[PDB]
């Protein structure tokens, strides 16, 4: 009458809903399959999501390198934070929230780049194999195959 873990509320005497929507087959790139309003997968389907992700990735690039770049006498550029940008007409609030308030990379010590990971925030790759081989190693490298071989030869 009521199989364990069946998940049907009527078998457990639980208040059900009755209205159970059909499952449509339409799919969204960064969304989920499921019941939606009419017009939804045509206005916010995979095309809209991919376009908005593309536009967000494009607009990330000036946002990642956000700052006041000022040319010097030698033609070099000095980057200084938008937190030092002062405004004339808001009373005692000379410093105001800027785009760097919403994206505070330097507060966390994160060297952001237009491709997210920057020079001083580079992804660290190191080879775990320690420059030795799978078998027949003489030195500071004693692998599992070497352990098998030494166990057999004793």
């Amino acid at each position: 009458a009521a199989v364990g873990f069946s998940g049907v509320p009527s078998q457990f005497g639980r208040p059900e809903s009755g209205v159970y929507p059909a499952e449509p087959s339409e799919q969204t790139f960064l969304g989920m399959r499921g019941p939606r309003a009419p017009g939804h997968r045509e206005n916010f389907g995979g095309k809209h999501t991919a376009t908005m992700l593309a536009i967000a990735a494009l607009l990330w690039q000036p946002v990642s390198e956000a700052g006041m770049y000022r040319m010097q006498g030698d033609g070099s550029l000095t980057k200084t934070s938008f937190n030092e940008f002062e405004v004339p007409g808001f009373g005692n609030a000379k410093k105001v929230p800027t785009i760097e308030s919403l994206f505070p990379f330097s507060s966390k010590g994160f060297d952001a780049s237009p491709v997210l990971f920057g020079k001083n925030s580079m992804i660290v790759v190191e080879d775990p194999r320690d420059g030795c081989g799978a078998y027949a190693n003489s030195g500071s490298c004693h692998t599992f195959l070497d352990e098998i071989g030494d166990a057999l030869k004793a």
Partner: protein
């Protein structure tokens, strides 16, 4: 119903022979998982980018633009990347290629709808493909050169990783 390229394997069902370069070559059945339009758009983009990168490696061995030698020094191939990241060149390149790739994303989704051929940006300002036959020959040549340049630029950059020469210096020096 067997593959022409690999005669002991079946012809993949998503492959039909319509696309340029179709020889029934998909032994691992990648076209059964992904869309063939997405796959052809990806193949054309990888191939065109690799053709440009191969020609770039050859010409950057051959010569450099005025003033690049001062900023770069005696650095070739991927070794310039980091330097030109500290300089503003690669950021500007990424900005404008990202701007192009936004409309590339819209074009890819249009292709996935089925309103646009994969890799068809209708960019023929010199009207090279007047005849449909010339169009077919240029399509086959484009896909073949793109695949060849994919292999070529892979070889060039990994040979640079081994010797630090450059594709044309390595030929003239072992």
């Amino acid at each position: 119903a067997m593959s022409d390229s690999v005669p002991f394997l079946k012809q993949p069902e998503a492959l039909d022979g319509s696309m340029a370069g179709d020889v029934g070559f998909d032994p691992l059945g990648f076209s059964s998982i992904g869309d063939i339009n997405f796959l052809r758009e990806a193949e054309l983009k990888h191939g065109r980018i690799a053709m440009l990168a191969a020609a770039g490696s050859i010409a950057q061995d051959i010569f450099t633009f005025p003033g690049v030698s001062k900023v770069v020094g005696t650095a070739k191939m991927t070794g310039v990347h980091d330097i030109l990241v500290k300089q503003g060149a690669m950021g500007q390149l990424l900005l404008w290629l990202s701007f192009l790739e936004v409309f590339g994303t819209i074009a890819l989704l249009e292709t996935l709808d089925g309103k646009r051929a994969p890799g068809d940006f209708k960019f023929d300002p010199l009207n090279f493909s007047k005849n449909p036959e010339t169009f077919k020959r240029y399509q086959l040549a484009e896909i073949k050169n793109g695949r060849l340049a994919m292999m070529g630029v892979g070889g060039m950059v990994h040979g640079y990783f081994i010797t630090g020469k450059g594709p044309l210096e390595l030929l003239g020096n072992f």
